[PDB]
Design a binder for this molecule. Structure first.
Ligand code: NAG
Ligand code: NAG
Ligand code: NAG
Ligand code: NAG
Ligand code: NAG
Lengths: 299, 49, 240
């Protein structure tokens, strides 16, 4: 309205703005062995897949981009262009070789021989899948038979389960008794790789990365650079991935040598320890409130 | 007692996920991309409303 | 090389076997937590291959240092990995190598040939300050989501033939990233050489339970309530 009567009215709210930003990433300078996982010149069969654990190192992904043009680079729970800033607890890497047309089988909630008898992913998977052609490396002109896949199994495979049993499968009532007779077939089938094969049957190297987010104090991060520490000001902070804004003050809290954070009745963060210097600091929200306007009548 | 209980329940309701990956907007903003954060944000908005 | 005979007895656990669930600081609050705990007033075994199940609570009170380290494995064979923990005067060694263990692995004091025939393929090795240090030592071991978590506590105690009555939270000791199955476990003994002595310990098993823990203003847990023990505790948990 263009006319206001005498009284007091609530119009809007105000909040103190932040001053600067604080970064307190750890100071380890190791390089995660991503280069060793790739271009290893030897990739195990799909029915027995390698599993490597990565932790306690600074993870960089720039080498991946310049490694090779990718048939598939699909990240499910994380945007692929932001992996250079997050911080994870532990990294899992699984590498193997599979046929070209079966790449689509590697995905959460999928079906197929490889999906149910070779390698099964969980429904809540949070990671990335990388698949690139390797026809020029693992395709003998006469035929490479070192790569084998399981074909017959009694039941499905649970997520992240590996089977290496090699026994004659029995598809009938009579027992195989240890011979490859009728109704009895070998469990493993050998791939045939030749350079003359068309696309869809040439071998492809696949690497699956699995993360562990929102867990114990994380270790796998740090492409960025840390900053100094300020107190008694409305500032932004990033402590090992814990991001926020507020005022940092000295804390008289008796932290046990194994706790990292602090919580209250409302279950919100109110204390934290600096990774570089072991010191407990209290966090307080910056000032905010409402604004009221008092005026007589416009007349 | 009633006033304190009501305020405590209202504050405690902020930690529910309502069917999203997390209950904190700050991480989702800094962990995902714009074209896919709205799906997670909508459920939190509905629950808090 | 068999010089050991084990006798069984049964006793009451009372309110023992409480550990800090996470690494989050709290004060002057009551917190509800659902996790694997030792049920209150449970039925623990006294010993003078045991299944691992979902976790093990171990208790000892002997000072003669006869107990040192443990063996964890599914088939206890060199065909599969098996955790081996050895505590000694200077350090503690933890290995996951597929050792070919013997029927009755006992330390010679210090040749390990009697414990296992040979070492082989493995990836993880750990060396640190020894876990061990009138004294009661309580330990909690659990393997979950590819992590072997070990909690422990050491407490002075008077001359008592059974477990004391009180509260003592078990601070975390270690969380090893191994990621292997565990089905059976065995206790290692060190006999001077070849005298055969005697040792005793308490064994209990963990179960999934909901507990109400009380934090003091000062960083420590001082009380706990098992919600499924009786109607009174259920009412206490409901009323928080
Ligand atoms: C504990 O269990 C044993 C056998 O499992 C039983 O004989 C005994 O009565 C139970 N109770 C006590 C208090 O030992
Ligand atoms: C105790 O264990 C440590 C750790 O391996 C070892 O270096 C030391 O030699 C051991 N002491 C004896 C007496 O064997
Ligand atoms: C250990 O495992 C590897 C991998 O399968 C195998 O090649 C080796 O023969 C095994 N035994 C020893 C003693 O390394
Ligand atoms: C461990 O042993 C159990 C029972 O023998 C078996 O089902 C399982 O596949 C084995 N491996 C793992 C990683 O649990
Ligand atoms: C609590 O901690 C403070 C500071 O360490 C101390 O003054 C007090 O005695 C402690 N109370 C206990 C341990 O009951």
């Amino acid at each position: 309205s263009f006319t206001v009567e005498k009284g007091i009215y609530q119009t809007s709210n105000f909040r103190v703005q932040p001053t600067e930003s604080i970064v307190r990433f750890p100071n380890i300078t190791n390089l995660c062995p991503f280069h060793e996982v790739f271009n290893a010149t030897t990739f195990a069969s799909v029915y027995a897949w390698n599993r490597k654990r990565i932790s306690n190192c600074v993870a960089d992904y720039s080498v991946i981009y310049n490694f090779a043009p990718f048939f598939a680079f699909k990240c499910y729970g994380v945007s692929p262009t932001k992996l250079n800033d997050l911080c994870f607890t532990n990294v899992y890497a699984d590498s193997f070789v599979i046929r070209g047309n079966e790449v689509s089988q590697i995905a959460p909630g999928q079906t197929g021989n490889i999906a149910d008898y070779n390698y099964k992913l969980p429904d809540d998977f949070t990671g990335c899948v990388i698949a690139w052609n390797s026809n020029k490396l693992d395709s003998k002109p006469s035929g490479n038979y070192n790569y084998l896949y399981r074909l017959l199994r009694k039941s499905k495979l649970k997520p992240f389960e590996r089977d290496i049993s090699t026994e004659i499968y029995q598809a009938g009532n009579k027992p195989c008794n240890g011979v490859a007779g009728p109704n009895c077939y070998s469990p493993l089938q050998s791939y045939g790789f030749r350079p003359t094969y068309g696309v869809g049957h040439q071998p492809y190297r696949v690497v699956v990365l699995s993360f562990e987010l929102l867990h114990a104090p994380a270790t796998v991060c740090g492409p960025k650079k840390s900053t100094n520490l300020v107190k008694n000001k409305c500032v932004n902070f990033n402590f090992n991935g814990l991001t926020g804004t507020g005022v940092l003050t000295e804390s008289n809290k008796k932290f046990l040598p194994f706790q990292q954070f602090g919580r209250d009745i409302a279950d919100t963060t109110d204390a934290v320890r600096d990774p570089q210097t072991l010191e407990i600091l209290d966090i307080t929200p910056c000032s905010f409130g409402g604004v009221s306007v008092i005026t007589p009548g416009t007349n | 007692n009633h006033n304190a209980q009501a305020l405590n329940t209202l504050v405690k309701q902020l930690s529910s996920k309502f069917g999203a990956i997390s209950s904190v907007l700050n991480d989702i903003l800094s962990r995902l991309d714009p074209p896919e954060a709205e799906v997670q944000i909508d459920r939190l908005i509905t629950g808090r409303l | 090389v068999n010089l050991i005979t084990r006798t069984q007895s049964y006793t009451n656990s009372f309110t023992r076997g409480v550990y800090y669930p996470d690494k989050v600081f709290r004060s002057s609050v009551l917190h509800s937590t659902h996790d694997l705990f030792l049920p209150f007033f449970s039925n623990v075994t006294w010993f003078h291959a045991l299944p691992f199940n979902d976790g093990v609570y171990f208790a000892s009170t002997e000072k003669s240092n006869i107990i040192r380290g443990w063996i964890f494995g599914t088939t206890l064979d060199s065909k599969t990995q098996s955790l081996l923990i050895v505590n000694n005067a200077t350090n503690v060694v933890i290995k996951v190598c597929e050792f070919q263990f013997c029927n009755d692995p006992f330390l010679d004091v210090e040749s390990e040939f009697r414990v296992y025939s040979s070492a082989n393929n493995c990836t993880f090795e750990y060396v640190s300050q020894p876990f061990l240090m009138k004294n009661l030592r309580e330990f909690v071991f659990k393997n979950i989501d590819g992590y072997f978590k070990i909690y422990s506590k050491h407490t002075p105690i008077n001359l008592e033939r059974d477990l004391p009555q009180g509260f003592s939270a078990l601070e975390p000791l270690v969380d090893l990233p191994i990621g292997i199955n565990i089905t059976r476990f065995q206790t290692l003994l060190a006999l001077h050489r070849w005298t055969a002595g005697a040792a005793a310990y308490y064994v209990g098993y963990l179960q999934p339970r909901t507990f109400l823990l009380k934090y003091n203003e000062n960083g420590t847990i001082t009380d706990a309530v098992d919600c499924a023990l009786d109607p009174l505790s259920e009412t206490k948990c409901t009323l928080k």
